[PDB]
Amino acid sequence: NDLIYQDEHASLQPLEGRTVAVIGYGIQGRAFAANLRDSGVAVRVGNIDDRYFELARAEGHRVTNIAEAVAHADIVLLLIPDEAHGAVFDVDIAPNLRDGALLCVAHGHSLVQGDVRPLPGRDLAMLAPRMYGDPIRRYYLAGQGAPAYFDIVADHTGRARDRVLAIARAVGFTRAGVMALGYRQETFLDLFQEQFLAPALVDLVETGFQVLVERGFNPKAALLEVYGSGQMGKMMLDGADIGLDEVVALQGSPTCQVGYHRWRGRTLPTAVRELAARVLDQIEGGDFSAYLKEQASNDYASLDDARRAALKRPLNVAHAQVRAAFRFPTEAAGGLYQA
Amino acid sequence: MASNDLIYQDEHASLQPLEGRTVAVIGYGIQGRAFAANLRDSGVAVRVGNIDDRYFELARAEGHRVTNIAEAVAHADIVLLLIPDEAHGAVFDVDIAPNLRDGALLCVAHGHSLVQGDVRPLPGRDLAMLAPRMYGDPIRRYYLAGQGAPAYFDIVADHTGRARDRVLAIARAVGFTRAGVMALGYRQETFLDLFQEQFLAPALVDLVETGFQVLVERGFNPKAALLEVYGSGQMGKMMLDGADIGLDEVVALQGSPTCQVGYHRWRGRTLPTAVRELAARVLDQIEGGDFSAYLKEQASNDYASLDDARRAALKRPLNVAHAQVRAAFRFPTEAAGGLYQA
Numbered sequence: 001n002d003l004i005y006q007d008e009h010a011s012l013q014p015l016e017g018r019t020v021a022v023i024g025y026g027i028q029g030r031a032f033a034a035n036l037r038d039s040g041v042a043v044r045v046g047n048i049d050d051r052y053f054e055l056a057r058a059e060g061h062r063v064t065n066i067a068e069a070v071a072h073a074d075i076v077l078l079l080i081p082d083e084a085h086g087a088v089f090d091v092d093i094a095p096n097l098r099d100g101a102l103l104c105v106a107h108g109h110s111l112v113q114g115d116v117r118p119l120p121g122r123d124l125a126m127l128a129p130r131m132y133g134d135p136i137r138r139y140y141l142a143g144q145g146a147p148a149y150f151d152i153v154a155d156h157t158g159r160a161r162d163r164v165l166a167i168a169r170a171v172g173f174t175r176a177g178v179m180a181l182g183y184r185q186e187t188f189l190d191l192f193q194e195q196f197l198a199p200a201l202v203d204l205v206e207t208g209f210q211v212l213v214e215r216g217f218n219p220k221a222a223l224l225e226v227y228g229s230g231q232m233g234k235m236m237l238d239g240a241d242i243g244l245d246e247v248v249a250l251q252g253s254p255t256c257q258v259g260y261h262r263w264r265g266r267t268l269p270t271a272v273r274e275l276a277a278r279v280l281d282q283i284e285g286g287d288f289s290a291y292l293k294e295q296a297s298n299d300y301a302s303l304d305d306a307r308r309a310a311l312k313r314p315l316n317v318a319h320a321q322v323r324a325a326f327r328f329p330t331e332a333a334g335g336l337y338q339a
Numbered sequence: 340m341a342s343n344d345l346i347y348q349d350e351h352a353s354l355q356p357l358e359g360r361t362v363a364v365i366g367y368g369i370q371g372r373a374f375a376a377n378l379r380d381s382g383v384a385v386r387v388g389n390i391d392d393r394y395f396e397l398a399r400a401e402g403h404r405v406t407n408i409a410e411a412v413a414h415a416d417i418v419l420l421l422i423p424d425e426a427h428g429a430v431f432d433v434d435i436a437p438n439l440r441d442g443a444l445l446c447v448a449h450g451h452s453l454v455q456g457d458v459r460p461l462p463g464r465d466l467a468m469l470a471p472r473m474y475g476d477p478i479r480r481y482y483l484a485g486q487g488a489p490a491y492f493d494i495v496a497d498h499t500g501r502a503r504d505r506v507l508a509i510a511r512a513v514g515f516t517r518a519g520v521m522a523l524g525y526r527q528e529t530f531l532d533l534f535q536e537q538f539l540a541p542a543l544v545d546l547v548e549t550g551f552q553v554l555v556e557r558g559f560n561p562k563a564a565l566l567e568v569y570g571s572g573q574m575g576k577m578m579l580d581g582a583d584i585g586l587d588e589v590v591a592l593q594g595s596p597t598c599q600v601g602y603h604r605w606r607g608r609t610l611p612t613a614v615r616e617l618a619a620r621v622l623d624q625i626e627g628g629d630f631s632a633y634l635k636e637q638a639s640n641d642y643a644s645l646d647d648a649r650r651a652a653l654k655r656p657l658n659v660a661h662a663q664v665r666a667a668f669r670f671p672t673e674a675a676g677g678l679y680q681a
């Protein structure tokens with residue numbers, strides 16, 4: 001049965017007098033470091049020589065190379081790209097991790113692949129948020145949080161669980177709920193969302209756009225309806241609260257509800273479920289992991305080509321025209337991660 | 340051609356056309372309540388026309404002048420018909436057409452009743468569409484934050500010669516010009532809107548549900564499966580942030596390199612030709628009147644079949660798991676009480 005920890009099941013007491021080293025200052029690192037500091041936890045940043053080092057300095061952190069950050073830490077959070085874990089673990093972290101220190105990863109992939117391993121005399125855990133950095137930070141400032149999964153991999157001290165959950169409470173995840181989930185299951189589940197569901201959702205939106213344009217509809221209007229208006233995003237985000245079918249029952253005109261229920265459960269051929277299973281097979285059997293290791297070559301050169309090509313697609317050419325023509329509601333983001 | 344679009348923002352509209360004029364909001368539902376609240380807060384005289392149901396009493400509780408539909412229309416310079424589309428014909432013929440003042444403007448928020456001839460131009464009066472691209476709660480939240488949602492508009496009949504500026508004055512008062520109000524024919528709006536509702540929304544939910552089903556079959560924790568496919572809010576946040584910056588751009592900005600490599604392995608490759616073929620079949624049903632005939636049947640005995648569909652949907656594994664997850668994990672929400680009070 002599920003172990004789910006909220007604020008009533010965790011406290012900041014395990015962090016009293018302890019220093020947390022945030023290794024990395026990217027999407028997750030910057031949010032962890034800002035929320036730890038604002039929760040009254042002693043925090044320092046370990047980072048390589050790049051723009052993120054200078055950003056952490058600009059945002060008032062104590063910033064050093066990774067080895068020095070680890071040497072001064074009771075708890076180490078490894079918040080860099082998963083393919084970089086092995087080399088940073090072997091050279092910078094393992095030689096410097098204090099006796100009884102806790103190392104946490106935010107994704108199980110390096111644990112599954114054996115690139116991060118238990119060390120005699122130390123604790124090892126996963127604390128894997130189910131959300132990206134900007135919302136984790138916005139939620140934090142509003143007294144809210146995003147869910148996370150956790151796993152205690154090695155517990156020399158016997159205190160790893162309460163220390164991991166104290167980090168979770170300091171960063172805000174216990175405000176939603178932190179659920180026990182094995183690091184191997186987290187790895188495969190996370191990769192499936194990234195490789196099947198996210199591309200399929202965008203491909204579906206793009207298909208709607210392409211069919212409307214082919215059938216003679218105004219391209220700006222087509223782009224707005226399939227996502228650009230924010231209606232489809234709002235339906236999916238409100239759906240997280242109340243349920244997706246319930247959003248239609250509450251917010252749809254009767255015309256909309258009759259239309260939706262004419263095709264609900266009937267839109268997809270078997271090829272979609274079949275492809276989902278094929279993607280999960282690639283994830284569970286190591287095919288994706290071998291692909292990722294290849295792709296990390298030349299600092300992800302192939303991904304650079306894919307990112308640049310995607311911007312040239314009709315959907316993204318139309319996006320730029322629609323976004324220049326219609327003002328989208330935005331909140332100022334400058335200084336979001338300052339104290 | 341991109342260059343040919345007519346898009347109106349705040350710089351292209353004003354409230355001057357509404358000076359001394361009363362707007363009758365007919366209906367107080369998802370759209371009606373947002374229009375009435377925003378018109379009032381924009382300093383526009385507004386009254387509500389509504390049948391004898393809970394929405395009449397809600398409009399009273401929220402401080403409006405509320406009467407039957409005929410009386411609201413008889414006292415109005417501008418009439419906004421914000422009731423379900425299948426009810427337009429009977430309300431138009433009995434309650435609106437006999438009471439619409441000489442030179443008055445009637446607006447609909449969807450082209451369907453215009454396509455079907457259930458709402459028609461009247462000698463001496465103006466007729467228009469102002470069709471929001473968002474539901475009521477966000478229209479209201481955006482309004483209070485100095486923001487708005489897009490809308491499409493069409494001037495169908497313009498006896499006065501003033502219909503365009505009066506429609507755009509309503510749009511400015513309700514907030515749509517803060518985003519942009521684009522000229523689009525009522526027939527095109529009808530088919531485009533119905534396509535989003537009948538192909539895209541069900542396909543997105545069907546896809547989320549497919550992800551959930553496959554994970555549960557393959558032995559994944561059902562709460563975790565539900566959270567990842569939408570329950571965490573991550574997929575909704577990605578699609579809503581995507582509206583701002585682009586969907587591929589959200590992944591480039593907010594994805595780990597692991598996530599981006601995974602996404603681009605399958606981007607543009609996940610769907611078989613059968614999906615675009617079904618989209619074309621749905622559009623054929625919409626363009627040729629098949630959906631309109633289905634809607635007229637379904638409206639029978641106050642949408643009894645829709646009641647059966649709504650209740651059956653809640654029993655699907657996805658929605659059983661939703662209730663378990665939502666009880667176990669706190670989702671960030673804003674207090675909504677009094678959102679539509681002055």
Ligand SMILES: NC(=O)c1ccc[n+]([C@@H]2O[C@H](COP(=O)([O-])OP(=O)(O)OC[C@H]3O[C@@H](n4cnc5c(N)ncnc54)[C@H](O)[C@@H]3O)[C@@H](O)[C@H]2O)c1
Nearest residue numbers: 024025026027028052079080084106107131132593594595
């Ligand atoms: N992006 C998310 O929302 C998210 C959510 C949950 C979990 N995760 C996990 O969090 C971890 C961090 O991911 P992210 O998305 O924040 O990454 P990111 O791409 O934002 O990481 C950038 C950071 O990594 C550092 N870095 C990059 N390459 C490095 C290398 N070779 N050696 C040392 N440092 C290097 C940079 O200096 C910078 O501090 C990963 O394990 C990822 O799977 C990410």
Ligand SMILES: NC(=O)c1ccc[n+]([C@@H]2O[C@H](COP(=O)([O-])OP(=O)(O)OC[C@H]3O[C@@H](n4cnc5c(N)ncnc54)[C@H](O)[C@@H]3O)[C@@H](O)[C@H]2O)c1
Nearest residue numbers: 251252253366367368369370394421422426448449473474
């Ligand atoms: N729901 C949306 O977000 C949305 C967005 C844009 C356009 N629209 C359009 O706005 C209009 C109103 O839709 P809605 O979603 O607000 O509807 P709704 O289901 O919320 O409408 C309920 C309202 O309609 C009234 N009503 C219901 N049946 C009636 C009848 N037979 N006679 C008279 N009044 C009746 C009720 O008293 C109440 O005031 C429609 O033309 C719809 O297509 C809806």
Ligand SMILES: O=C(O)/C=C(\O)C(=O)O
Nearest residue numbers: 251252253256472473474
């Ligand atoms: O655009 C919307 O949000 C909703 C509709 O068009 C509807 O419910 O009919």
Ligand SMILES: O=C(O)/C=C(\O)C(=O)O
Nearest residue numbers: 130131132593594595598
């Ligand atoms: O969960 C997320 O938001 C993002 C990831 O898992 C990722 O970028 O790897």
Ligand SMILES: [Mg+2]
Nearest residue numbers: 129130131190
């Ligand atoms: Mg993830």
Ligand SMILES: [Mg+2]
Nearest residue numbers: 253256449532
């Ligand atoms: Mg509609």
Ligand SMILES: [Mg+2]
Nearest residue numbers: 471472473532
């Ligand atoms: Mg619509």
Ligand SMILES: [Mg+2]
Nearest residue numbers: 107190595598
């Ligand atoms: Mg991930």
